[PDB]
Scaffold this motif. Sequence first.
Motif, PDB file in Angstrom:
ATOM      1  N   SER A 259       0.798  -1.218   0.000  1.00  0.00           N
ATOM      2  CA  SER A 259       0.000   0.000   0.000  1.00  0.00           C
ATOM      3  C   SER A 259       0.834   1.273   0.000  1.00  0.00           C
ATOM      4  O   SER A 259       0.266   2.367  -0.091  1.00  0.00           O
TER       5      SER A 259
ATOM      6  N   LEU B  63       3.457   8.011   1.308  1.00  0.00           N
ATOM      7  CA  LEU B  63       2.414   7.836   0.309  1.00  0.00           C
ATOM      8  C   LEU B  63       2.701   6.593  -0.528  1.00  0.00           C
ATOM      9  O   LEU B  63       3.721   5.920  -0.359  1.00  0.00           O
ATOM     10  N   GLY B  64       1.779   6.289  -1.438  1.00  0.00           N
ATOM     11  CA  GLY B  64       1.934   5.158  -2.328  1.00  0.00           C
ATOM     12  C   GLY B  64       2.204   5.570  -3.758  1.00  0.00           C
ATOM     13  O   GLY B  64       2.381   4.720  -4.636  1.00  0.00           O
TER      14      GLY B  64
ATOM     15  N   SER C 250       0.139   7.181  -5.962  1.00  0.00           N
ATOM     16  CA  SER C 250      -0.995   6.800  -6.791  1.00  0.00           C
ATOM     17  C   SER C 250      -1.699   7.991  -7.424  1.00  0.00           C
ATOM     18  O   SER C 250      -2.714   7.803  -8.103  1.00  0.00           O
TER      19      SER C 250
ATOM     20  N   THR D  87      -7.550  19.252  -5.357  1.00  0.00           N
ATOM     21  CA  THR D  87      -7.210  18.147  -4.465  1.00  0.00           C
ATOM     22  C   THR D  87      -7.837  18.349  -3.096  1.00  0.00           C
ATOM     23  O   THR D  87      -7.598  19.374  -2.450  1.00  0.00           O
TER      24      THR D  87
ATOM     25  N   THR E 118      -7.653  16.134   0.351  1.00  0.00           N
ATOM     26  CA  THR E 118      -6.899  15.018   0.907  1.00  0.00           C
ATOM     27  C   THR E 118      -7.015  14.991   2.425  1.00  0.00           C
ATOM     28  O   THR E 118      -6.974  16.036   3.080  1.00  0.00           O
TER      29      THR E 118
ATOM     30  N   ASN F 286      -3.684  11.366   8.776  1.00  0.00           N
ATOM     31  CA  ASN F 286      -3.701  10.979  10.188  1.00  0.00           C
ATOM     32  C   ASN F 286      -4.922  10.120  10.522  1.00  0.00           C
ATOM     33  O   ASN F 286      -5.767  10.474  11.346  1.00  0.00           O
TER      34      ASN F 286
ATOM     35  N   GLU G  50      -6.977  18.864   3.978  1.00  0.00           N
ATOM     36  CA  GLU G  50      -6.133  19.731   3.165  1.00  0.00           C
ATOM     37  C   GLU G  50      -6.730  19.878   1.774  1.00  0.00           C
ATOM     38  O   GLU G  50      -7.024  18.879   1.112  1.00  0.00           O
TER      39      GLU G  50
ATOM     40  N   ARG H 208      -6.314  21.813  -2.118  1.00  0.00           N
ATOM     41  CA  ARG H 208      -5.368  22.414  -3.051  1.00  0.00           C
ATOM     42  C   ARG H 208      -6.134  23.195  -4.108  1.00  0.00           C
ATOM     43  O   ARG H 208      -7.033  22.653  -4.759  1.00  0.00           O
TER      44      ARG H 208
ATOM     45  N   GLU I 153      -2.342  25.611  -0.680  1.00  0.00           N
ATOM     46  CA  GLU I 153      -2.948  24.568   0.134  1.00  0.00           C
ATOM     47  C   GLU I 153      -3.635  25.188   1.343  1.00  0.00           C
ATOM     48  O   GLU I 153      -3.104  26.114   1.964  1.00  0.00           O
TER      49      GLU I 153
ATOM     50  N   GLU J  21     -10.160   7.935  -3.068  1.00  0.00           N
ATOM     51  CA  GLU J  21      -8.842   7.569  -3.565  1.00  0.00           C
ATOM     52  C   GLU J  21      -7.881   7.390  -2.396  1.00  0.00           C
ATOM     53  O   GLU J  21      -7.925   8.147  -1.421  1.00  0.00           O
ATOM     54  N   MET J  22      -7.013   6.386  -2.497  1.00  0.00           N
ATOM     55  CA  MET J  22      -6.043   6.078  -1.454  1.00  0.00           C
ATOM     56  C   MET J  22      -4.638   6.216  -2.020  1.00  0.00           C
ATOM     57  O   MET J  22      -4.287   5.536  -2.989  1.00  0.00           O
ATOM     58  N   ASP J  23      -3.843   7.096  -1.419  1.00  0.00           N
ATOM     59  CA  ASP J  23      -2.444   7.301  -1.789  1.00  0.00           C
ATOM     60  C   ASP J  23      -1.606   7.116  -0.527  1.00  0.00           C
ATOM     61  O   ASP J  23      -1.338   8.074   0.201  1.00  0.00           O
ATOM     62  N   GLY J  24      -1.199   5.877  -0.272  1.00  0.00           N
ATOM     63  CA  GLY J  24      -0.374   5.604   0.894  1.00  0.00           C
ATOM     64  C   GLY J  24      -1.174   5.739   2.174  1.00  0.00           C
ATOM     65  O   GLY J  24      -2.258   5.162   2.321  1.00  0.00           O
ATOM     66  N   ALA J  25      -0.638   6.513   3.115  1.00  0.00           N
ATOM     67  CA  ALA J  25      -1.294   6.757   4.392  1.00  0.00           C
ATOM     68  C   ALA J  25      -2.301   7.896   4.338  1.00  0.00           C
ATOM     69  O   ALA J  25      -2.882   8.240   5.373  1.00  0.00           O
ATOM     70  N   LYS J  26      -2.521   8.488   3.168  1.00  0.00           N
ATOM     71  CA  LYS J  26      -3.471   9.575   2.995  1.00  0.00           C
ATOM     72  C   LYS J  26      -4.706   9.082   2.252  1.00  0.00           C
ATOM     73  O   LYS J  26      -4.740   7.977   1.707  1.00  0.00           O
TER      74      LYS J  26
ATOM     75  N   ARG K 223      -7.525  10.584  -0.665  1.00  0.00           N
ATOM     76  CA  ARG K 223      -7.858  11.638  -1.611  1.00  0.00           C
ATOM     77  C   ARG K 223      -9.323  11.531  -2.014  1.00  0.00           C
ATOM     78  O   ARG K 223      -9.851  10.429  -2.193  1.00  0.00           O
TER      79      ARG K 223
END
Lengths: 127, 127, 404, 404, 108, 108
Positions: free
Chosen positions: B31, B101-102, B104, C48, C50, C53, C137, C139, C169, C277-282, C284
């Motif tokens: 992930s 982040l990933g 994506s 954006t 996002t 935490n 956050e 953008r 931002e 949308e999922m980008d890592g630990a965040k 979107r």
Amino acid sequence: EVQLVESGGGVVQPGRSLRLSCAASGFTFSSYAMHWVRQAPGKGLEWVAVISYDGSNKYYADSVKGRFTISRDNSKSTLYLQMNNLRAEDTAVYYCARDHLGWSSIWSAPESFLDYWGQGTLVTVSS
Amino acid sequence: EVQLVESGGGVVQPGRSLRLSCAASGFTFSSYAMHWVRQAPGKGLEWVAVISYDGSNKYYADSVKGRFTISRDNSKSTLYLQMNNLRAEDTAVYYCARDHLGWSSIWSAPESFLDYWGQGTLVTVSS
Amino acid sequence: MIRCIGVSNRDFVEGMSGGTWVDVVLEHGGCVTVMAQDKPTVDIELVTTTVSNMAEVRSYCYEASISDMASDSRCPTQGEAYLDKQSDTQYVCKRTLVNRGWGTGCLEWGKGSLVTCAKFACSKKMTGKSIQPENLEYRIMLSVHGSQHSGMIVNDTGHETDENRAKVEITPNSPRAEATLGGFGSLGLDCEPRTGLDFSDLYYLTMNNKHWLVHKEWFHDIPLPWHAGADTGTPHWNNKEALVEFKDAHAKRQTVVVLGSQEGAVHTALAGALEAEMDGAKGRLSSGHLKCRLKMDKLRLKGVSYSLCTAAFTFTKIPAETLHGTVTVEVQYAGTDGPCKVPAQMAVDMQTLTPVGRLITANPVITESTENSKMMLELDPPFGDSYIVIGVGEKKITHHWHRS
Amino acid sequence: MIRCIGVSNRDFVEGMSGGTWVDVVLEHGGCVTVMAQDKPTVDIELVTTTVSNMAEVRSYCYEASISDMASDSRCPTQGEAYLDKQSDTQYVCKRTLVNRGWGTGCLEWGKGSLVTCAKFACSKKMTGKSIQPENLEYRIMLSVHGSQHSGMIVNDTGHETDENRAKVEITPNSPRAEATLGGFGSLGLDCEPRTGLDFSDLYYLTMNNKHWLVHKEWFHDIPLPWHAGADTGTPHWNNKEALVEFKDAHAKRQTVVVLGSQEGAVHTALAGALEAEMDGAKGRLSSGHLKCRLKMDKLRLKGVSYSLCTAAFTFTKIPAETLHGTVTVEVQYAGTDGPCKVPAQMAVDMQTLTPVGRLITANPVITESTENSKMMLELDPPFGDSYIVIGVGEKKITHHWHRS
Amino acid sequence: QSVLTQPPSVSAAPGQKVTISCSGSSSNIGNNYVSWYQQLPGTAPKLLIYDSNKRPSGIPDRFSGSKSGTSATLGITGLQTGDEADYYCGTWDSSLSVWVFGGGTKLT
Amino acid sequence: QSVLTQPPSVSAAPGQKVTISCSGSSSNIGNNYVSWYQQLPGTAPKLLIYDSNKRPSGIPDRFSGSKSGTSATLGITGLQTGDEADYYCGTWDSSLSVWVFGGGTKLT
């Protein structure tokens, strides 16, 4: 559309081994029990082996007990018969046959009958 | 609870290959995006490569482009860095770093920072 | 500029004659063209939303497998049955009563004890994460509408080195932001998070690259095995009987079968849920609204003292109507003048050349000193028949335009 | 007998003085003990409900994947979009409109056509087969209660060579059967197959080694791709969009993605349905019903011209009570005097030996002529205190007994 | 001479009713289901009769399967020149735990 | 000499206020999120500052992040001898499509 293609049989010497194969297609192979039936030239039919849908139950004719071994790979939908320690009398045209049942009950063997037959594979034991 | 374990270092003659590997535990490795950062002893930190969460995109530093190949195996949660044609300036401690982040989205790279680091593995090129 | 003109939901907000403050509402995937008297036209669009935490709350398993299974039976009045791995938390068991008698190894007729266990493993799981409002956050992309190359711009790639474009931002604990637009002055911003969403009653749910926002009550009532928070290694799965069921029991055994994958069942349930949308630990989002209060007094005009473009223009494209009733014209200026002002107006009477309508690309200016440049212009024509006028004097071009 | 007297669902049907007809209800996992005046006790039990030669009607797909995703778009007022694969029935497409303009490769603004296709492949499917009374066949087991070795019979194995156990079969078109029970006469069986169940409103459904009986209307309204019957090679799937969804479309593309596996979603819908076995092309049932009529006038006692067993019996087990209040007693007979009628009764007055209650194994007869033979009996005692008296003369057997 | 015994050779004039019968024991034919198979000259066996009274789809009603006692009989009403072949019966033997065939009967 | 230019060494007595500024261009620092890292002697780098003014849970509030134009600054109010280490500013460069670090700042 159902079809069974036997293969793996030629001319072999006594005392040695041989492995046959039956290619199944047109039905869920993992759902049906399967048989082997050989016929000597100009002779009657002789049932050889049977294997259930999950390959847990196997029965052999008294003439081949301990010498043959039926097996199947449900993934590739093929049927194997390992014939070793052969004799001159084992020369016959070997057919694989589809059984209407998967042999998943006590009442499957009585109700059993061979549904579809293959075409044969002439195995010959000469010396 | 997050851990990154790099391994594969040692000494190597110039011109040959080497493949560092970093094992991840404590998070969903499939992930997140991952980084390689090398640091020569006494020198500064030098970013090497980044790979997205599913290996879709790969970016390399100009000092390693065409020689190093970053890769990931999300099955076993491990990270790889395939280095070939090694020179003397490649002598450094190689850390794998967990990106926050990933990668994506179009905006992940501007938002990218390195969350956790590994203890490092030393790759010396002696001659 | 191209992105704004192509967006369907585009709002045209106008300021004052000498005013300083205007209000807008920025929607995701939408543009807001902001016009002011004797001031450049700036485009404001949210790009954006996002979140960050997000602490993991609970994880449900939707595909499982069993192994290391066995059964133990006992005669009636021989006590409850027992297996070694019954107290193991990685195993699911079920006590049951089966009929025993004289032909089945017992000495008395009755219902004997029977227990069947199986080791529980989870192939794939889904996870719900907490969302707090402060970790928000936004953008916002600020672009100058029409600086002679804005027709070449369709996306954000290149906004860093472009002085006529600036991004900002915004967080709920940092609503103000100022962004300089190069030679067109600088913009002010004071935004207000305006996404109706009860984050205190929402979880961020992910399952196999598919992610949504779900309600807490619905998430707490999911009939699947679960464990709170998260764990490294192997966690203890609660409610393991949700994916494993025990069928009819024979004399000394019972069958144990895993249920099919519940992925499609959840996708069916979340057909109306909002996608994320999922980008890592965040996380979107593609939904969102922002109430910003622009400060536009610092927006300057670029070509104040510049001359007019004296040479001849040429149309590179036949003018077309936009989805907003405006016209886009692309002119080519063959002169080697330096930065000059584009003569661009619309008139109904060719004698007086009285300006009708207005320019959306307010006060267009050429900035290239080489021959045969290009520039896109957006005009707000009057209703009915009118003429598009570009240039001065003899070799100025006209093009008749009718607007419904 | 053992499997019949150990079962929980055991009905007791009584005959008449010289009656010829009794009614019975035959359910799976159950036994009916039929007693009659001066007639041997016979056990009836339905052992196999099986269906065969079912017509495949419709097959639904519950897991799929895509391939060869191609797209094609055209400008506004430039006509509809087209792909070569749009006509292929193995591919699924979706018409849609998306904003185009001058920065997107077109000469006029507005919305243009767009089509995106994908090759439809089905990972796993399920099949619904039709059932007609021309497919049913019930197998009933007919055993004799008390042939001195039914106390060591626990299942059907070996019933062929056993003359005291007969096997009959019933179809809706042939609802009658007759069989011989050795030296105990013969039994008739006239059954109603209509009262079995309503098999015109149900389908037989197979899904990945698991099989159910489901309603006809519940099966039609399943929202999944489907074809009619079956076909070799590749058949034609209808309503392919139940698993394939088209996500947000850019100016020249459209993301195609498939839903998760719907196997677990089908399992949850099949909670209240009846589960069935699969034996090849045959279907096997374990949940049924059967009302039948028994012709018992041809039932007869084994040899009544025998003499009473004069030798001494000895208890082999300790008398145990069954789940229905009856007492099973196993005895050993030391005599070598051929076959003889076993003297067995219950007497509340130990001096006159007047019979109270009845024997479930009516007229027990030792058929072996060797020493130390074993026979198990069953008695239906009167409530309260009574004496189990087995044998005659001095060495006769007495065991006190109380029944609630 | 074999677990199930049928006549080695029977012959009937074309267009006439001919019957073939194989007899066994109470462990094979008595309880279990008898099946028949037609092997045309130089061909593979062909399932003729199943469940001891039933015709597979495609087999004309010229053929008929019966079963009475411990011996099942095959029926051919109105023989035709296309039926000359070898005919085998078979079923499962419960006492032997071995599937068995009949001796065969070449029809003429 | 490197894409991001920070001074190589800054020294300060304990308790003093110290700032460490690294400058870049509009492609790396001017728009993207600057992150700071602390590398204690013999230790792997450790995330000091993220999103160019934020502290992770655990970093003492003596450390502050700042950004202005195309140059970001680090801050330590009340330097203590447990903070003597190397500090690296780093961010993503959109013109290069390459993540870049700084030269490093050794603190005494």
